[PDB]
Amino acid sequence: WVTPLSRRQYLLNFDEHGVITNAVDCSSSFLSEIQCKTQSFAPNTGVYD
Amino acid sequence: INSGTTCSNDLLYSNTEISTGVCVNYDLYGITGQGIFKEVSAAYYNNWQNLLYDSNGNIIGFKDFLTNKTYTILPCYSGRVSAAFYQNSSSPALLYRNLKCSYVLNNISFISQPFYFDSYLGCVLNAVNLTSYSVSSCDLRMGSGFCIDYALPSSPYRFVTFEPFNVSFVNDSVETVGGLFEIQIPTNFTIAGHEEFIQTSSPKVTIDCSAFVCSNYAACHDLLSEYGTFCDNINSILNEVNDLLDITQLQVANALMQGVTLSSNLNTNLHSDVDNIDFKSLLGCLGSQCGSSSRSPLEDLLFNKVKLSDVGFVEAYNNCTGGSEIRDLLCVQSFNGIKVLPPILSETQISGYTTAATVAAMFPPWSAAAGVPFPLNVQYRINGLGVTMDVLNKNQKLIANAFNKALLSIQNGFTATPSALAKIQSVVNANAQALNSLLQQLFNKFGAISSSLQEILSRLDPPEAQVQIDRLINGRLTALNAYVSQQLSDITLIKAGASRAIEKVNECVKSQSPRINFCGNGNHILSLVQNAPYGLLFIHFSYKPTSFKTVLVSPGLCLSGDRGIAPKQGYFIKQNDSWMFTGSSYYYPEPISDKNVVFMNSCSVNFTKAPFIYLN
Amino acid sequence: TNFTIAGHEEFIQTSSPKVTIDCSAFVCSNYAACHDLLSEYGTFCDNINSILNEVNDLLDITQLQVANALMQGVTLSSNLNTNLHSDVDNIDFKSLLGCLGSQCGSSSRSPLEDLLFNKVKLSDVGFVEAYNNCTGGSEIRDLLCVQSFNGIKVLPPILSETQISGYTTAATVAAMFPPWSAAAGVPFPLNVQYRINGLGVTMDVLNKNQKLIANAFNKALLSIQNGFTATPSALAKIQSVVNANAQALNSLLQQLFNKFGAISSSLQEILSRLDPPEAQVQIDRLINGRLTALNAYVSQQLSDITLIKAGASRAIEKVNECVKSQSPRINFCGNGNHIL
Amino acid sequence: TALNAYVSQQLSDITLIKAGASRAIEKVNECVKSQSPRINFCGNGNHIL
Ligand SMILES: *[C@@H]1O[C@H](CO)[C@@H](O)[C@H](O)[C@H]1NC(C)=O
Ligand SMILES: *[C@@H]1O[C@H](CO)[C@@H](O)[C@H](O)[C@H]1NC(C)=O
Ligand SMILES: *[C@@H]1O[C@H](CO)[C@@H](O)[C@H](O)[C@H]1NC(C)=O
Ligand SMILES: *[C@@H]1O[C@H](CO)[C@@H](O)[C@H](O)[C@H]1NC(C)=O
Ligand SMILES: *[C@@H]1O[C@H](CO)[C@@H](O)[C@H](O)[C@H]1NC(C)=O
Ligand SMILES: *[C@@H]1O[C@H](CO)[C@@H](O)[C@H](O)[C@H]1NC(C)=O
Ligand SMILES: *[C@@H]1O[C@H](CO)[C@@H](O)[C@H](O)[C@H]1NC(C)=O
């Protein structure tokens, strides 16, 4: 399998051992936009603009 | 530039017709932009005129040379999207305010959404139209009385209405049924409690204007010395905010300690109950032997759930040098100039003042009750609401048990889900967020090559270093100005709240005011005061009926001889063919006398005539 | 020797339009070379939104407190239709009641409220209608849609005007029909007689003269109703607040046409005439000025919200002490001889 | 920048000035021209005139 690359923003999550476990692309969906705005993976309930 | 006839045909293109109704990029003889065209009929274009401008210098029209037609230029839509997301959900709901679903699905969206419908606010995506159902509280408020609710298993989101308040309904009449009205009078009652928190202070924040900017570098200090003082304006604002906080605390202490006198024979270890009412959970220590802590058990339970208190900051700052782990953010903030100072008065002194104010309304000479004993004052304040004195004199142990149960309930309610602690933790989190933002402000480039002065001083020349440090200095000074403006805006509201706090302390606790619907909710009886983190806690006792009955009452009667009688805080009932009097808050028939009836000298029109009342 | 009854009016501001501003949409409309520089001022964007959200939350809490004060301890019967019962003791209340019961619909305001709202266009419903008549037909050359195209937009409040009108109607009915939950259980004529007697008037004249009092109340209500044809003080303030809001919005919008010492106030000409190494400075020159303007605007808003909240608290106190009860505070509700 | 800071400080202080003036108006209307049935408002407990 081959896929192209580009310069884009990504969110990284490091555990207590320094291993990447989760990641989300901020330019994929609106939930990913909310996650990158809150810099987390389980944002609180609210109305995000 | 970009206007005229002399053009460069290096990048040549073919001429295209002018399209109307779509937002496209146009190159009209050098005029470049983006907008929508519209064919109109304009006759103001002369021979030497081909463009239409406004007062701001924007093209809003033109006339083509090849085809003498007129058009208007208007930009297309540009807005944002409002999304409501729950705690754990797959995808959040969408709402395009003031836009139809057709326009969204045809112009700004290219995803085939299965759920879509129009509303009063706009097109709603990923939701169900259930406006026929109403709720009392919802965390996703959209406006105009609509809010989105989440239901765990179509789509889990629902579009319902919002109605947080409603009135109580009865099955009585709204007319005069046979000359008498139909109203309900309570037959049984109890005592209920209610807590309330009012913020009276805020953490005193002090910022070192010479440490936040130019921490330890000498060239940075020499460059900052060229901007004048630029730090005295911040220091004066911080000092005046601290002075306002100190004046507020002193005024609160004076209001708590205004005109109070006790006896020199109390010990708080043997005299802690009156009329079988337990008050041990609302008293500290007053006597000879007592430790460094004088907080009541309620204050202890309140302070044990908050970490950032008057002593918490002191302990956190003590645990910065040496120790085991210095990973706390408070030490990092203190190492940059941001530090919190303790208030002028300790919490133990406020707790002692509150204990003295509470005792002043519990033992002779009853300073906080104008010289009236506690049970007598309670009976008077209950009678003032329309309750006969007989049922109060007969039911005293019941009132004591109700007070004890209310105290136990208000003490146990703070364990699982309190209400006063929410405001305290919200204030703490707001202060922490402000401090974290002010700290993270130092990690911005502000147009420079880096946000660290060490790299700039170890990589570039002194002139380049100055050029790169100037922008950082300006940005940090702007941030400090914004922060002190925010601090002023917050201290104004803190003063506004402390004013009402002092007013309620003076008019609801240490005295009984005739102001109805001010301390409680119309049936207020007694209010107490307790010490709380960054404020005070009030315990409001009220009169709460439990049972009711339907009776027929009369507004007023007229006796023989064109005389009239009018009741005060009561009504006239009829039993066994006899007119009597009853209270407005308790059903207890009693003979008609002169101490509860207003005498008149005129017979009204709609008053019931009864020449059988033998009253002088 | 002889007396009459006079009426007065007073307007107290309790809320304000909720203005939301986006840093990106205001600074860099649709340009990437501008976003690349705005990304450096990261912390300057997520502070204006936070301040505006705090202001909106404070306004919502204020509106909820006003609603709670208007709907605190109101017991009404279930046999009131608001159309069969509209007058008591020869005193009309048609111009002061809306619609209450299981027979109403969307329209629930009163004729007086309708007459007052028919002269004010820049209301929440007005903003909604304007944003609907924006782009997509009904040519949007107005300034509101132009402000909306740059990030400046006004959001509607949490509670609509219909719910507030219903709350006021319920509060008015609470002191008009039994049980009198807003008059301590005293009927309206007896309450008026007691309030007049409390000033030093004997009960004989009050008991003998009741139709005169009813006619005086009706005449006062009619004079208050047919008095908005001219320009009163209440309507003057209701227009002045929205005029000041519009002036502030236009002054904020006009800031986009300033050069701040650059070659031009438009990023298109800078990006189409100069190279990026020479255009970055020109873009930052405008970014700084626009950020300063937004900071000044949010500072002014945070300064005004305090006075707004103070006025709202004063209105809540007047509602709790002068409307739903009779407080023995002289020179507080009226000019000494206040009745109700 | 200095002028903006000064006018911001003035606009901030105006609110406290207006609050104090409103309190003064209330105290004048409820303690000088009339005897209010309130305690610990005009004076200190035993207030006469
Ligand atoms: C939106 O789409 C419709 C249909 O595709 C089209 O007729 C209309 O011109 C579009 N609007 C704009 C502003 O491009
Ligand atoms: C447009 O007007 C000019 C001025 O009279 C004229 O010379 C030209 O022929 C006109 N163009 C067309 C297409 O009629
Ligand atoms: C949503 O439901 C309400 C109540 O049934 C109805 O009046 C309204 O027309 C519905 N909306 C749409 C877009 O069908
Ligand atoms: C009134 O309520 C109390 C509380 O439960 C109860 O103990 C008492 O028996 C009741 N009295 C009557 C007459 O129902
Ligand atoms: C008076 O009240 C106290 C406190 O409730 C009680 O202990 C005492 O027994 C009462 N006196 C009499 C004679 O009942
Ligand atoms: C008081 O004035 C009214 C209005 O003119 C009049 O109807 C009434 O008779 C007057 N009362 C007396 C006692 O003159
Ligand atoms: C007295 O009753 C009549 C009907 O019999 C009614 O029209 C009038 O309004 C009533 N007046 C008062 C003061 O209740």
Q: What is the 3-state secondary structure (H, E, C) of chain C?
A: CCCCCCCCCCCCCCCCCEEECCHHHHHCCCCHHHHHHHCCCCCCHHHHHHHHHHHHHHHHHHHHHHHHHHCCCCEEECCCCCCCCCEECCEECHHHCCCCCCCCCCCCCCHHHHHHHCCCCCCHHHHHHHHHCCCCCCCCCCHHHHHHCCCCEEECCCCCHHHHHHHHHHHHHCCCCCCCCCCCCCCHHHHHHHHHHCCCCCHHHHHHCCHHHHHHHHHHHHHHHCCCCCCCHHHHHHHHHHHHHHHHHHHHHHHHHCCCCCCCCCHHHHHHHCCHHHHHHHHHHHHHHHHHHHHHHHHHHHHHHHHHHHHHHHHHHHHHHHHCCCCCCCCCCCCCCCCC
CA distance B165 to B181: 28
Closest by CA to B472, choosing from B207, B208, B225, B214, is B214
CA separation for the pair C323, B517 (Å, rounded): 11
Look at residue D42 and give its three-state secondary structure.
coil
Residues 6 or more apart in contact with residue C73 via CB below 8 angstroms: B521, B522, C181, C324
Nearest chain D residue to C295 by CA distance is: D4
| Amino acid type, B32 | T
| Nearest beta carbon to residue D5 from set B233, B489, B496 | B233
CA B302 to CA B415: how far, in whole Å? 9
Tell me whether the omega of the peptide bond preceding residue B514 falls within 30 degrees of 0, making it cis: no
- Give C210-214's long-range contacts (Cβ < 8 A, gap of 24+): C210/B605, C210/C89, C210/C90, C211/C90, C213/C5, C214/C89, C214/C90, C214/C91
Alpha helix (H) residue ranges in B42-110: 101-103
DSSP state of B152: -
> Around Cβ C125, how many Cβ atoms within 10 Å?
17
Residue type, D43: G
Local structure of residue B343 (DSSP, 8 states): P
Q: Which ligand is nearest to the CA of B190?
A: 4
Distance, in Å, from the CA atom of C171 to the CA atom of C186, rounded to the nearest integer, reads 15
For residue B278, which of B305, B259, B266, B296 has the smallest C-alpha distance? Answer: B296
CA of B242 to the centre of ligand 1 (A): 60
Chain D residue numbers with beta carbons less than 8 Å from the beta carbon of C299 are: 8, 11
Amino acid identity of C255? Q
By the 8 A CB rule, do C282 and C270 touch? yes
Q: Are B149 and B176 in contact (CB under 8 A)?
A: no
* Cis amide prior to B153 (ω within 30 degrees): no
User: Contact B360/B367 with Cβ under 8 angstroms?
Assistant: yes
Of D4, D18, D35, the CB nearest to C296: D4
Return phi, psi of residue B213, to 5°.
-105, 140
> Cα(B558)–Cα(B608) distance, rounded to whole angstroms?
6
- Residue B269: C-alpha distances to residues B20, B299, D1 (Å): 90, 18, 62
Cα distances (angstroms) measured from residue B522 to each of B384, B583, C76, C309, C327:
12, 16, 17, 24, 12
Q: Which of B202, B115, B195 is nearest to B159 (CA)?
A: B115
Yes or no: say if B356 and B527 are a contact pair by the CB < 8 Å rule: no
> What count of Cα atoms within 13 Å lies in the side-chain half-sphere of residue A19?
2
Helical ranges in B34-184 per DSSP H: 101-103
B439: part of which helix (H) or strand (E)? helix B420-440
C-chain residues near A49 (CB < 8 A): 20, 22, 49
Strand, coil or helix: B608: strand
Residue B227's identity, in one-letter code, is Y
Structure tokens at B612: 């059988």
- Would you say B320 and B500 are in contact if contact means Cβ atoms under 8 Å apart? no
Pairing status of strand C75-77 against strand B168-170? parallel
> Separation of B497 CA from ligand 4 center, angstroms?
41
| 3-state SS track over B228-256 | CCCCHHHHHHHHHHHHHHHHHHHHHHHHH
> Which residue, B317, B335, B337, B329, is CA-closest to B207?
B337
Taking a C-beta distance cutoff of 8 angstroms, is the pair C258, C289 a contact?
Answer: yes
Nearest to C253 by CA among B55, B478, B99, B309: B55
D39 touches B at CB < 8 Å: yes
At A32, which helix (H) or strand (E)?
helix A30-38
Q: Is the CB of B584 under 6 A from ligand 4?
A: no
As a whole number of Å, the end-to-end CA separation of chain A is 37
**B423 inside 8 A of chain D by CB:** no
The count of other CB atoms within 10 Å of the CB of residue C254 is: 11
Residues in chain D: 49
Separation CA C109–CA C98 (nearest Å): 4
Strands B557-559 and B608-609: parallel
Question: Could you identify the atom of ligand 3 that is nearest to the CA of residue B119?
Answer: 13
Q: Cβ of A9 under 8 Å from any chain C Cβ? A: no
**Least CB-CB distance to B165: which of C68, C124, C162?**
C68
Upper half-sphere CA count for residue B385 (Cβ side, 13 Å): 24
D47: burial class by Cβ within 10 Å (0-12, 13-18, 19+)?
Answer: middle
Q: Cα–Cα distances in Å, from C281 out to B529, C267, C287, C292?
A: 60, 12, 10, 17
Q: How far is CA C177 from the centre of its chain?
A: 29
Closest among B584, B567, B580 to B612, alpha carbons compared: B580
| Short-list B309, B247, B292, CA closest to B491 | B247
Within chain A, how many helices (H) and strands (E) appear?
A: 1, 3
Which residues in chain C are contacts of D4 at CB distance < 8 A?
A: 292, 296
CA distance C103 to C87: 19
Question: C331 vs D11: CB contact, 8 Å cut-off?
Answer: no
Q: How far apart are the first and last CA of chain B?
A: 105
B211 with B439: CB under 8 angstroms? Answer: no
What is the C-alpha separation between B210 and B208, in angstroms, rounded?
5
Is B401's C-beta closer than 6 angstroms to any atom of ligand 4?
no
CB C75 within 8 A of CB B168: yes
Residue numbers in A near B92 (CB within 8 A)? 30-31, 34, 48
Q: Which amino acid is at C295?
A: N
Phi, psi angle pair for C243, to nearest 5°: -65, -40
Q: Which residue out of B605, B607, B608 has the highest number of ligand 7 atoms within 8 Å of its CB and is therefore the one to mutate?
A: B605
Q: Is the C-beta atom of B117 inside 6 A of ligand 3? A: yes
Q: Say what the alpha-carbon torsion angle B526, B254, D13, C12 is, to the nearest 10 degrees.
A: 20
CA distance from start to end of chain D: 50
Tokens of C172: 């008015």
Contacts (Cβ under 8 Å, ≥6 apart) of B213: B220, B224, B472, B473, B476, B477, B480
Residue B148 and residue B139: Cα distance in Å, rounded? 8
Tokens 């989101």 belong to residue:
B157
Could you tell me which residues come within 8 angstroms of residue B295 by beta carbon, excluding any fewer than 6 positions away?
B284, B303, B347, B348, B351, B531
Distance (Å) of CA C44 to CA B288, B496, C149, C288, C292: 57, 29, 21, 10, 10
Instruction: Pick the residue whose CA is nearest to atom 12 on ligand 1.
Output: B22
Give the pair of three-digit tokens for residue D34.
């009339």
d(CA B56, CA B556): 74
**CA B22–ligand 1 middle distance (angstroms):** 6
Q: How many residues does chain B have?
A: 616
Q: B475: helix, coil or strand?
A: helix
E strand or H helix at B413, and its extent?
helix B397-416
